[PDB]
């Protein structure tokens, strides 16, 4: 897919 | 969300909330004869091309295309880091072909604008063996989009793939699409923890301070498996048992072949660690048995959020196995779930070691299979993205993703996509 995503 | 669809309207796909009773092929059989042996319509100015990957100049084009277009403007500092070997591995699974390797280069400047790629698998979907195509890879450069050029290349690639006689393809997507079979998360095992809070790939909690942050991510510096050897050509017969074995809990599988197994686990020799990409490992024991295997890639990130670094390291977890349950008859059993728990833990704590050891500084995993029960315990975190798994020209009923209602993990009962792509 895209991948590396994030988060808080 | 539901009719906002003016391409995908009309293609063979299972449609939101429908309520799929009998599994199969969606459009009426056709054959590859009464489907036009010449590629669609192209904007005036622009024109198609195939991508050699045993070709210099055409892998240097597509990589700095993605390289260049593949963020969406959410700019943390990153570009994705798409490298000859990365491409060298992903596009030539055994079957592969320049032509499934599209792109559209402008007919004067030469420059590619657009990509899409598709490579051949057998995919098992409830038992029914499914000859198909695996799409990835689709980008269009920044001053090219929202004009609709995405439908066409999809109906490029379909075409030369029905001209094949190949009528299905499996393909993932973050946006919700008509369709998806099942949806999982990313979760984030930070390896360099100060480096990603650095770089901005991670928060930094106000009552569990910097310190606390690195001392709780904090992991060995070798593996603690005994057996923990590394994948040989060798290993092959043995472990393609274990793995087909392994893999067979799930609805949802690429139906590998000793080739495309020996491919994908077993990269190029002699890479630099600084440029290898898979990475396979096997528990043998003294018995000479194979008992494990494990395997993650790499695909870094450029930077220019940090003014110390320049690139990011990222490992994905990929394909695994283990025989841990292979005395039960039920999977979920509450003691089934015992034994292969703690070993996928173990294993996958190994494989995070192996990770960083690597240089990676971030793991990401997907909730799918069952790293829905390592995940929380070695302690992944879940992070924006979300994954949908789609099957072109092909009804089936949804498979459990890994997620709960409210997007938390659910160690009850996992994941059932027995698929990860690249
Ligand atoms: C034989 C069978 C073979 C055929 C199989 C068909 C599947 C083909 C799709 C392949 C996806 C697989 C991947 O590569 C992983 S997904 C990761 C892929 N890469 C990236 O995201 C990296 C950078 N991103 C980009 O370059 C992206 O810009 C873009 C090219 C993905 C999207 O381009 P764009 O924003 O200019 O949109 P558009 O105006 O050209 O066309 C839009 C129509 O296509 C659909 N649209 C937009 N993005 C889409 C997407 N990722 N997947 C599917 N449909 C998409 C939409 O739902 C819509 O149509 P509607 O109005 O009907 O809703
Ligand atoms: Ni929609
Ligand atoms: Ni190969």
């Given at each position: 897919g895209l991948y590396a995503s994030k988060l808080a | 969300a539901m009719k906002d669809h003016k391409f995908w309207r009309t293609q063979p796909v299972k449609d939101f909330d429908e309520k799929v009773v009998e599994e199969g092929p969606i459009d009426k059989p056709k054959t590859?004869?009464?489907?036009?042996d010449k590629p669609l319509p192209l904007l005036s100015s622009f024109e198609w091309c195939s991508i050699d990957v045993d070709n210099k100049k055409q892998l240097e084009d597509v990589f700095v295309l993605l390289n260049e277009?593949?963020?969406?403007?959410?700019?943390?500092?990153f570009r994705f880091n798409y490298t000859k070997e990365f491409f060298n591995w992903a596009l030539?699974?055994?079957?592969?072909?320049k032509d499934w390797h599209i792109g559209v280069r402008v007919?004067?400047?030469?420059?590619?604008?657009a990509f899409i790629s598709a490579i051949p698998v057998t995919l098992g979907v409830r038992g029914k063996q499914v000859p198909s195509v695996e799409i990835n890879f689709l980008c269009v450069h920044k001053q090219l989009?929202?004009?609709?050029?995405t439908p066409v290349l999809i109906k490029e690639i379909t075409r030369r793939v029905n001209k094949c006689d190949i009528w299905h393809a499996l393909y993932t997507a973050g946006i919700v699409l008509p369709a998806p079979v099942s949806t999982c998360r990313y979760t984030h095992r930070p390896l360099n923890w100060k480096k990603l809070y650095e770089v901005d790939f991670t928060g930094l909690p106000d009552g569990h301070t910097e310190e606390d942050m690195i001392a709780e991510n904090a992991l060995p510096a070798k593996t603690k498996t005994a057996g923990l050897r590394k994948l040989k050509k060798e290993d092959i017969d043995q472990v393609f048992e274990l793995f087909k074995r392994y893999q067979s809990?799930?609805?949802?599988?690429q139906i590998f072949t000793k080739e495309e197994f020996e491919h994908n686990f077993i990269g190029e020799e002699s890479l630099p660690l600084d440029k290898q990409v898979i990475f396979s490992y096997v528990v043998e024991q003294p018995?000479?048995?194979?008992?494990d295997f494990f395997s993650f890639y790499s695909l870094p990130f450029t930077i220019?959020?940090?003014?110390?670094?320049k690139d990011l390291g990222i490992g994905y977890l990929y394909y695994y196995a283990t025989d841990?349950?292979?005395?039960?008859?039920?999977?979920?059993?509450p003691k089934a779930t015992k034994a292969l728990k703690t070993r996928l833990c173990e294993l996958i704590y190994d494989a995070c070691i192996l990770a960083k050891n690597a240089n990676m500084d971030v793991f990401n995993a997907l909730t799918?299979?069952?790293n829905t029960l390592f995940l929380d315990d070695l302690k992944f975190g879940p992070g924006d993205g979300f994954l949908n798994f789609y099957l072109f020209n092909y009804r089936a009923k949804p498979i459990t993703?890994?997620?709960?209602?409210?997007?938390?993990?659910?160690?009850?009962?996992?994941?059932?996509?027995?698929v990860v792509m690249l």
């Open positions: - | 590859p004869e009464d489907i036009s277009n593949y963020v969406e403007d959410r700019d943390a500092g030539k699974s055994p079957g592969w072909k007919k004067e400047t030469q420059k590619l604008v989009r929202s004009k609709r050029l809990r799930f609805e949802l599988i018995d000479g048995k194979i008992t220019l959020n940090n003014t110390k670094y841990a349950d292979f005395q039960f008859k039920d999977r979920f059993d799918s299979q069952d993703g890994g997620l709960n209602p409210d997007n938390s993990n659910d160690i009850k009962r996992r994941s059932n996509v027995g």
